[PDB]
Design a protein around this ligand. Sequence first.
Ligand code: NAD
Ligand code: NAD
Ligand code: NAD
Ligand code: NAD
Ligand code: RAB
Lengths: 462, 462, 462, 462
Amino acid sequence: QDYVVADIALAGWGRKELNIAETEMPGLVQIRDEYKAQQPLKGARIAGSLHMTIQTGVLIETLKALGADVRWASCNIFSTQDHAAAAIVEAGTPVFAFKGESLDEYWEFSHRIFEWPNGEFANMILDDGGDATLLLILGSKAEKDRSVIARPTNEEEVALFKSIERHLEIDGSWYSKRLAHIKGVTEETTTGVHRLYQMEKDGRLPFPAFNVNDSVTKSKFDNLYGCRESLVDGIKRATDVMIAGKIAVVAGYGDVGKGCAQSLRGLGATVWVTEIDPICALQAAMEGYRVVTMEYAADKADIFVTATGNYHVINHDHMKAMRHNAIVCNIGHFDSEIDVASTRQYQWENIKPQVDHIIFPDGKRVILLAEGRLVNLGCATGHPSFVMSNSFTNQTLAQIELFTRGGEYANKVYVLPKHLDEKVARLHLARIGAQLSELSDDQAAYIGVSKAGPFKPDHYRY
Amino acid sequence: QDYVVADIALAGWGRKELNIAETEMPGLVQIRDEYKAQQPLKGARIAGSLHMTIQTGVLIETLKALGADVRWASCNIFSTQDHAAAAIVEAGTPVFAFKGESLDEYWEFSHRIFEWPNGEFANMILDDGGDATLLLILGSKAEKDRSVIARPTNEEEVALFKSIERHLEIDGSWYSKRLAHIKGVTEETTTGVHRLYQMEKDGRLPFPAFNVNDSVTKSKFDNLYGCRESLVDGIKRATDVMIAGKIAVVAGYGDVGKGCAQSLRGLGATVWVTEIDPICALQAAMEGYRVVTMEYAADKADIFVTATGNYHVINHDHMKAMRHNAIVCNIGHFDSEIDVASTRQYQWENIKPQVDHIIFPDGKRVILLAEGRLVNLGCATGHPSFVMSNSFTNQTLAQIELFTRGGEYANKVYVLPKHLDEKVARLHLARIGAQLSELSDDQAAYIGVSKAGPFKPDHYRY
Amino acid sequence: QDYVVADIALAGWGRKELNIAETEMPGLVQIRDEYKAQQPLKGARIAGSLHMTIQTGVLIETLKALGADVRWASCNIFSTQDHAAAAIVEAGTPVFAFKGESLDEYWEFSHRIFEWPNGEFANMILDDGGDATLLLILGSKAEKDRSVIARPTNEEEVALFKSIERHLEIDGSWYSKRLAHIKGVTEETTTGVHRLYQMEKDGRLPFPAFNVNDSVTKSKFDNLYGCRESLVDGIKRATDVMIAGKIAVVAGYGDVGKGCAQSLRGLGATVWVTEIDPICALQAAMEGYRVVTMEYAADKADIFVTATGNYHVINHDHMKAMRHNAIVCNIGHFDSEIDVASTRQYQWENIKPQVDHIIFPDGKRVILLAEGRLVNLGCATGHPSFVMSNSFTNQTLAQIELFTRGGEYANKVYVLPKHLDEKVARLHLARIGAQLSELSDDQAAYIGVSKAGPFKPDHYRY
Amino acid sequence: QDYVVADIALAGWGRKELNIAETEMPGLVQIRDEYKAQQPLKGARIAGSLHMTIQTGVLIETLKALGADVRWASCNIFSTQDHAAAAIVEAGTPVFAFKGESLDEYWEFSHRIFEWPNGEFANMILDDGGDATLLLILGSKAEKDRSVIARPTNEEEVALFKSIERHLEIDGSWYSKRLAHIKGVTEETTTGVHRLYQMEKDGRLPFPAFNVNDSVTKSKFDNLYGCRESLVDGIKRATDVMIAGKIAVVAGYGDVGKGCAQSLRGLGATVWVTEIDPICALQAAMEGYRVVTMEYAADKADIFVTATGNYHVINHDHMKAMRHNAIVCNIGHFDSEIDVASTRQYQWENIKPQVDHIIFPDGKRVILLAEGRLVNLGCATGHPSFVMSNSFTNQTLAQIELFTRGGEYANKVYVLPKHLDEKVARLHLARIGAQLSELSDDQAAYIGVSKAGPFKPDHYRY
Ligand SMILES: NC(=O)c1ccc[n+]([C@@H]2O[C@H](COP(=O)([O-])OP(=O)(O)OC[C@H]3O[C@@H](n4cnc5c(N)ncnc54)[C@H](O)[C@@H]3O)[C@@H](O)[C@H]2O)c1
Ligand SMILES: NC(=O)c1ccc[n+]([C@@H]2O[C@H](COP(=O)([O-])OP(=O)(O)OC[C@H]3O[C@@H](n4cnc5c(N)ncnc54)[C@H](O)[C@@H]3O)[C@@H](O)[C@H]2O)c1
Ligand SMILES: NC(=O)c1ccc[n+]([C@@H]2O[C@H](COP(=O)([O-])OP(=O)(O)OC[C@H]3O[C@@H](n4cnc5c(N)ncnc54)[C@H](O)[C@@H]3O)[C@@H](O)[C@H]2O)c1
Ligand SMILES: NC(=O)c1ccc[n+]([C@@H]2O[C@H](COP(=O)([O-])OP(=O)(O)OC[C@H]3O[C@@H](n4cnc5c(N)ncnc54)[C@H](O)[C@@H]3O)[C@@H](O)[C@H]2O)c1
Ligand SMILES: Nc1ncnc2c1ncn2[C@@H]1O[C@H](CO)[C@@H](O)[C@@H]1O
């Protein structure tokens, strides 16, 4: 049994929903059809680390339709949809993912995507959050300097470092030998891409990487419109709270915060925003959101949402000040946005899976969602299929490009060229009935672009 | 065992959520506290027929805190939250309610709320949708004229009429004897209140009734803001569909449609509305919604929502014309808004509980939600606690008024007086930090109201 | 010359805008066509007191096209569009109105509408604000008891009482003789309707009156959608201020206030609301507006709008607390919502017409718009033709009904019947392409209404 | 007299609006204060071509307060606020601008800004639309090759080429000698920036240029939030039209189009969008706008707005298909977005200044605003002071940088550095009460940025 999932019997259900998702994911479906004859991913062995949702399942089977062999884990302990995992396993793909797996299991699963049978090796990583990339790179450092895994500072590191030891005892060259085969990585999210840029700035990036997050059709769609639908979806499945009339504070006003702000406002919440970037602060103010400090908000707001990709944006003292039954969640990639660890000293009382009461010594309780893990994937199902098709069409193009032409790329982070970004968006217009217009020759000459595009300069912000 | 619920072990969970709901239902909590000394519902035996949600559980225990003895059923086969039912049963109240009960069970449960031990009788009905009221009134007619239950036209009637026969065999005077004890009814929803007005117009209303639906603080809050949060909540738990970019058609633009329209629009759907009332049509047009016929929409839209309280607003031919994987739901009180029965000839395939594919002969499938039953309660948890407190504070006041002073009322439908409607709203202002201002004497004289209110004439529409 | 306007040479311009307005006012065009053959207003001599705008112009000519003879004045010193007045005069109707007329000129003009030649008398009043009606009623009381005009409380009353004295000296029976000839009044605004209810309550109302404000198609349209467009229109023409990022406080959350709030919010203002009505306050809070006191708001907010119909909602001390270049305006009917009189002790500096700096002793200045008079009409053109067609279609039907059938009505305040309200709405659907659907026979029977309507019970709030 | 304005007597009014504007433009006030001691623009002789509004007035005086000597013209024939021009002249700056100037006057005025007394020369251009820069470049080319001014394609070019001929006859070296003295250009609008990129591409750019349009704080603010306020402002002053219920089509969904769409939607319009860029089209569709062709829209829509920066987006046949009293306007930089020339074959009837009826042969009329010139500036006052402060703070910094350090830049198009973009934003926070939060040391290390910023990578799109 080359997989670990919750219950293989959930497969029928997963498949019914994969069927539906295809009709909602025209980018993936049209890319299957365009490229299946060519079989461009034949000989690709893709280790994927990414929320094992129905949406990811349509991606996985797109990669396979194009010839890839694939092994998959989730990039969060709570993001898996078990019926998605089951259907993908049933259709022949190794998946090491279930909702609620432990941290030790998580990291073990990150190794398993790198354990191919019959002497083969993964030669591509599809990463969301940089954990698969991290594991190989940190594991390899550890081979030559055990000190890099000696001093864990948090439970994530205890688990990661432990799993590395465990693998180094088995084979002293476990990581470096697998690293050597990786042709490149395609990375989905802002936090992951941040990790790649830091490796680039440091000269420790050992292969080419695509930054899929910053395709226009990704950052400005998925991060934004996707959270605009799924933040509240997560909060409500967790708590069934009324939004109208509440004071919701969104920490961070990038694309994820913009989406979050917009969905809370739409339902009649008073929306406050917190920011360190004055440009983004001014944008928030220009939409009518009050821009405040977290210290100012902690004792006043009803709902707190971290969307920063930063560390300890909600800390012990913010939570100590909150009103009784304040709801606290994180929609950023990592749970460290909230100092959950500092509340463990207090008595907790579980309400239901992923909804916990933290009881402070004066009896005041905070309702914490998904133990701080991404709330949309943890209490709901993450973004809907339609917008996820943008991100995953990008992913599929990036995987094709690196597998087929990676030799043309240096050890740098790249973004897909604008013409492909434009293609991704174009493939989604028909599903929703949008009629694209066409430049006349005279018009094309007048604004200095080709009728076929690209239509915008490379610094354009959309 | 004087109850029927899914699983008594869900009680702990139900109670945790009732605890939270109290902090979200300041109207109910403050009314408990104001009246508990007086015990105004001492000697009240309230038969309730109403969605057995967490929110209803806080209502039930408010009635009990005020001295009522209570027996409860749900007013929809799919609206029960089983953990709510379990906690209320565990705290000592007979509940005949579970999610997914059959139609025969439904109507049997409607009898059970009328079966009190030790020779007692219910003397108050708390009704949502008019089913408890209907049962006693139709049962009593049946006693003298069996022809009124002879010719059922639909599965609801087959079940109702069967359950009446079954009870008339036991006791030929089953209904009339129980009817004789009812001091009055308080009725929660537009469809229920419509049934009461028809009985009034016909002179078959045998006791006083309160129309709780048309308290301003009910119709204009619950129906409107409540659907503004829970329609999409239901659609997404069912289907996880993206709303942005879809064409959503809302049939009906009363308070329920207004709320629905507003939440679809907020998430970036193109919203079309259907109406028979030109005033409401013009309101919809004034918000930017295209007002179209269902015949025009059927082959074009992505998501269909009936919010009319009417019959067959989506019929066999509309559904036959729909695009593949169109989502069809109803948020009106009764499932007859959609002619579900006309699709039974086709092959169905269940996706998950309350989400079904209807496969037309050309292979095109429609995704029907909750078999047409109210989608917010059926695929989600109905309105959130906060707005439900308005409706239920109203309910509690209406029950107090009829139990204590029903002798002062004729056999007519009444609405609560404006001063109480205003009180209901006032009790909710503190939770959300709204600061009410006060008229000066000069101001009170100038606009001709008392400083204490009421502030508006009786025809005011808010 | 039987008129007083600013400039007759503006007529050509007014006529061109009247042509355009007709295509924006389908209710009035269709009513002219429907009733042309009958000439129901033949023999009607209508005295009108209503903002002399392009829109009122189309109303005047509709009344004349149905047979009425008309004389007109504006119901505000700053709301006349002089090109409108000119075009209406040039086409044969006496008009006594110009933008910027003094208060003495105002009340002289309200007498002129009651000075018909050849020994004739007005037999109908069409009023907005109730000033035409007040003139004749107060004047008649003054004939027998001068004490009623002994105690003016503001400049408008000083001017009104002077005008009554002056006319009484010419003819001690000037008012009573004209008052006797009035067969009915149609009153279209909330403040005037309050004045009429107040008269009915005290047995002082001598002819039948229609409350046109409380047609659904007036109140819930003109007051709301109109101010949603015209409030910012007025403030911008006056000040050209950015709305995005500002704190805007709306005093009063009735229909006008709802419109104002929604307008300011859409441009990215933070919208605060002030209310004495807890229901209206809870509505505001459910849209995400903060509900605060004026004392709280005075030293924080950027823009202040009064929308109450009440007295001294912004007082001296509020203004003294305001930030430099705070903008203060009123959109309610009378300027007394703001205590402008209390600021006359300070230096003022005119910025441009209807835009003044009030210079406080510390050098802090407040920007007051239109000396507190209704800002949308004073600094812009009021509501647009389209929505006004609703109100004026109601007015036209109201006039027809009282003039032709007034004998059947008591000396009380009436509202138009629902079927007529629905007609008003229906007449406006085609222009905006809204398609009304039609009940089937079964559907009509199912909800217990006729196919032709009316569709809602009289208490329905829409 | 070294100026040409409509009326010097309007100065007092302009000065009072300049005082107010200063309190709305904190970036410009703070920049004057920060750089007053240094006088960085001492010795700068700035020729400006930019809408002569109150806002540009504050910019002019900011430049003068930092030492610059200035001469100014408007960059559009209809966008001057004459009270603004008057107040700027009265305070000592030559201005050659008035609302309604002819095209011959326009281009004569663009020469006058380059006629400095006492043998001096402009050494900086501040341009909006690129007309000042075009004048000198084209003119210099014309000195050696008259064929470049042989083939005008529209009336503005006819007038431009006439003006070049005329000046060449006086001095065959008129342009080249002035062109040599230009040390730099700062260009603030998208169309002018396109003209500059086009010049760099062809080796024809003879001095360093700043693209100020593409400061985040310009493009994503002025173009968007400005048009969200000023588009409807312009259309309403021109036509007073109801927006609610109308179909409004926005050609182009760049920053301007996004602003326009959002404005129209907020007032209850049905908003359709036209786009040739599939990404911009998908963004529009994700807000619920229908994406349609102009051919589709022409006979259906009520209001048409061009926002493309392209040519002949509304053509003759579009206008011929339009409904009676369709409203047509343009908000892009040049009027050629609409083919107004093709309508001159028809009778026109002026309604009022910048509002014309185009009378078609079947009697159908179209309302054209401002002869196709930018409608917000032509029929209203453009964007409000607050947002313009962003753009003009960018302009001021751009001028300082090129004048003081221009020698370090190549003859290429540059953008301001992010830290300066952030500063612009930061300067505007206090006025609107937005509180910026500050990274802790660990947080700064965690996301790899400095506490002082900049906070985002150069590709960040906001
Ligand atoms: N849960 C999801 O489905 C989802 C979807 C997309 C991206 N993400 C993740 O969400 C996070 C945010 O992504 P993004 O694309 O918006 O990134 P972003 O960089 O565009 O936005 C982050 C913002 O947070 C602000 N910020 C940083 N530290 C702050 C602090 N201490 N206080 C207040 N603001 C602070 C920054 O100014 C920045 O604008 C990332 O971790 C990303 O991987 C999650
Ligand atoms: N699911 C929930 O949580 C919820 C909440 C409150 C009320 N309700 C129920 O929802 C239904 C609607 O309630 P409401 O308060 O909005 O009633 P309403 O009377 O205010 O609105 C119904 C609207 O439907 C329109 N209509 C009737 N027949 C139509 C047809 N064939 N096509 C198009 N429009 C038609 C009417 O013109 C009317 O405006 C009722 O059955 C009520 O009991 C449900
Ligand atoms: N400018 C216009 O084009 C326009 C249009 C329609 C009506 N009006 C006028 O606007 C005014 C309001 O009309 P409406 O239809 O909204 O009336 P409304 O009665 O519906 O609303 C007024 C609201 O003000 C509140 N209020 C009263 N005093 C207050 C105070 N001291 N502080 C805070 N809130 C207070 C009331 O509680 C009420 O909800 C009237 O004078 C009416 O004639 C103006
Ligand atoms: N009036 C103002 O106050 C104001 C303010 C800022 C900018 N502008 C001007 O507005 C214009 C647009 O500026 P922007 O910043 O939005 O530019 P942009 O490049 O960001 O947007 C223009 C959009 O138009 C689309 N387009 C081009 N041709 C089209 C066609 N034939 N049909 C449909 N869509 C088409 C492009 O694809 C692009 O997305 C420019 O001329 C600019 O100088 C005016
Ligand atoms: N969470 C909830 N708990 C109890 N009742 C709820 C509910 N959500 C909706 N409702 C109610 O359903 C009615 C329509 O049957 C409506 O009148 C009323 O809103």
